[PDB]
Design a binder for these strands. Structure first.
Ligand SMILES: Nc1ncnc2c1ncn2[C@@H]1O[C@H](COP(=O)(O)OP(=O)(O)OP(=O)(O)O)[C@@H](O)[C@H]1O
Lengths: 463, 463
DNA sequence: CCCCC
């Protein structure tokens, strides 16, 4: 009995509705997996696949009440969760899945085995996914204008290519990249090109994810990054002028983890999967509230140094020290990019870069030598080291150099340490930094009298 | 009559739905005591159980309306409230429960009597639960490298072993474990190994729980210790910097209490049971403003004295004092531990350590000596003893020494006390301790008079 | 329920 129960069982036997570990209901319609808590996806699937059931079952599914009964039966039948979005080298489209390691495009049940629950939102066109075209030469000219193929720009260009290509691989990336440069240098053009290329896998959020508390309450600004392969933030302010909050290192470290806590309004799903490449456009370098060794492992910088100016302001730009090259501005390029002219050309370029930079494992490495905020830590980290045991047979040398021994621990006088620091970094130049380092790296032998359990590398080098 | 009432009664006879003190229901589907406030779990269980009922009842449960009526009956029958997680010698694994006292593993229905809602998160395998393993040998070698098996490095090893074994205890512990050391001392890799070994029973929280109010408003960090056998803290804010908040001895005592304060968001069930031992990882000595016998009974310290470094910097690493023994670092160890390679060997190691520590009671013990902050408290407790009239039979000796009889009590002037202490503990080297003593125990009987209501142990011993 | 506070 229960024709409706039989219909629900038949639909469940097709493996077209699945329950995820988070609590979602993903359905397979029109050659793609979709989930949406606001749309009647299960009844949509029932109506869509009414054609694959017997003729006596097809006519029963034209009634919304009966479709809702079938949906209730299916919901009670789904008891086990599944693992979704586990292939980091598959790019999902609206009509199939592209193999990023092989170049094969799968449609239908071939693409169904990879439970890719997101998509670009548009259809793959193999007649445009071609190497040579009128659009490809123009796109290559644009890219070579933005990032010149010169010898002094080799490393920066390769880093730019790697960062752009990493927006295809759906895994957790462990760095935050900063597109730094002066005005009119191509950063927004690059952003728009990437958005056109990867479609719905691209999202843009606010600086609140960098300068606010992520726990909070309902946070759609974080909940909108679930499974996105690229996240953009833009327009960092100048932190030198007091009045702007600094970037939270806690947020920076929390954004590189495989899961991020944040939930929408009227929703109970708090944890989102992190597959994102986070890129920040800025005219100014970042300043963080607190600097430590971990934070320095998650920051990378790509610099833009080509100006596109109108003919009136070309001469003033040619004498600027923030530009290496000046080019003529193009006034139709924005519209051409907006109309998705270079979508498949840039997609092909990104796939080629993915192949080139995906030597067995692809990983993003930090560039801490570019951020001025990290210079004080980087310099002093190679000059002073903790107490020494194998250098214990040098206590006479330490005493002659000014150090003292206390429980076989090297201690330096505060005044002597200040005088030594003044040589490498002037007091007038970095008094706040030197005083903070003295107060932070030193232990308190008393309320007033204290000592630093850190000796200079050069002092120990002296025999 | 009321066939649906009969069905509900028969389902209730199987003890598959229970009502917990938190207000929610727990159901037994697919061999797991699972609960949800968002899923139709009771109707799912009804549809699954329908096979066990008679034939005339089985065809009744194919209608969602009938299942809803049966659910209404079943949840109107549930009047008595029960409790979960009542057994401390059991480990819940994804497909059963392992017994600590008996060394037996029960699968399927045999795990039903144990109302365990949380689990480690990996299937229990008997074949890999063996001693003849190539993995346990390398694991023991790595553990020996991190903690040398020597007389000088024995107390630290014992404390480390007890802290690791505490995660298998299903009870409340009053001690908080601390990891102290230098860079690459094994703390992070030990944390990774423990996370791999215990699966979902490990949570990581920032520094908010330590440097903020534990209750405050919403405290997800505090609430995450709810049935979390291990709590981790990383990148602690060293106290040498001036202008940072402090960890509270009141918070330490609250964590030592058998139910720590903590609630989830939009919730009132703050009475969350505590089976947690907190592991705090840092690199600098903590500073506590108020230090006393109560705080000294709830503070544990474990110090690392090893370092692995590159061969180019191997001699420089061996030079340092923070490394008792210096070895050569292996870069693949990170991936090896992140891949959960030695999970069964580590689990058997912890089980064997628990068997060695199988005393009816297994309680953690503070190690206040290691922390440099508690040295002053040890000196004060061993030297500063309250003195007053109850030992009146020393008046002649006090007059001979130079003291006075204030109602036949033992007291010394503040200036005299400072002059006497100047020989033992330097005033410049004990300024904070002297100020605290003067503010606390320097009791006087007059506004202008200066006296202290205590005498040194030497003054007590010598008449 | 969010927002508001
Ligand atoms: N290769 C190119 N050749 C000619 N014109 C270009 C080229 N790339 C970009 N342009 C144009 O020159 C200007 C460059 O400004 P664009 O918005 O790209 O960068 P930006 O000012 O650095 O960005 P942001 O919005 O982050 O400040 C735009 O008007 C753009 O259309």
């Amino acid at each position: 009995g229960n024709k409706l129960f039989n219909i629900a069982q038949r639909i469940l036997d097709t493996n077209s509705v699945l329950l995820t570990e988070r609590g979602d209901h993903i359905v397979w319609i029109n050659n793609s997996w979709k989930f949406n808590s606001e749309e009647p996806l299960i009844t949509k699937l029932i109506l869509s696949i009414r054609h694959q059931l017997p003729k006596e079952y097809s006519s029963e599914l034209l009634c919304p009440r009966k479709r809702k009964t079938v949906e209730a039966n299916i919901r009670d039948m789904l008891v086990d969760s599944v693992e979704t979005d586990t292939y980091p080298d598959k790019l999902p489209f609206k009509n199939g899945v592209l193999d990023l390691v092989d170049g094969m495009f799968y449609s239908g049940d071939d693409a169904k085995k990879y439970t890719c629950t997101v998509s670009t939102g548009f259809k793959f066109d193999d007649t445009k996914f071609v190497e040579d075209s009128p659009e490809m030469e123009e796109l290559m000219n644009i890219i070579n204008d933005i990032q010149p193929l010169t010898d002094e720009n080799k490393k920066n260009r390769e880093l730019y290519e790697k960062t752009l290509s990493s927006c295809l691989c759906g895994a957790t990336k462990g760095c935050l990249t900063f597109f730094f440069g002066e005005t009119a240098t191509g950063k927004s053009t690059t952003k728009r090109l990437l958005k056109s290329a990867i479609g719905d896998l691209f999202v843009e959020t606010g600086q609140t994810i960098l300068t606010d508390v992520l726990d909070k309450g309902p946070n759609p600004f974080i909940a909108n990054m679930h499974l996105k392969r690229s996240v953009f933030c833009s327009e960092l302010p100048d932190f030198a002028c007091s009045g702007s909050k600094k970037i939270r290192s806690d947020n920076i470290k929390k954004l590189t983890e495989p899961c991020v806590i944040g939930r929408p309004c009227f929703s109970n799903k708090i944890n989102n999967r992190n597959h994102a490449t986070i890129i920040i456009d800025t005219n100014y370098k970042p300043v963080f509230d607190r600097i430590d060794n971990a934070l320095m492992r998650r920051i990378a910088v790509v610099r833009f140094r080509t100006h596109f100016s109108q003919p009136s302001g070309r001469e003033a730009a040619e004498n600027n020290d923030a530009y290496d090259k000046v080019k003529l501005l193009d006034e139709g390029l924005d519209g051409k990019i907006q109309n998705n002219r270079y979508r498949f050309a840039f997609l092909y370029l990104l796939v080629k870069w993915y192949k080139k930079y995906h030597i067995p494992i692809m990983k993003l490495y930090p560039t801490p030598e570019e951020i001025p905020d990290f210079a004080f830590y980087l310099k002093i980290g190679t000059l002073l080291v903790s107490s020494s045991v194998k250098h214990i047979p040098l206590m006479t040398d330490l005493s002659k150099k000014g150090y003292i021994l206390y429980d076989n621990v090297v201690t330096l006088p505060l005044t002597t340490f200040q005088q030594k620091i003044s040589k490498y970094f002037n007091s007038r130049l970095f008094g706040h930094d030197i005083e903070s380092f003295i107060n932070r790296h030193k232990k308190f032998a008393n309320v007033s009298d204290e000592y630093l359990q850190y000796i200079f590398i050069e002092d120990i080098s002296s025999p």
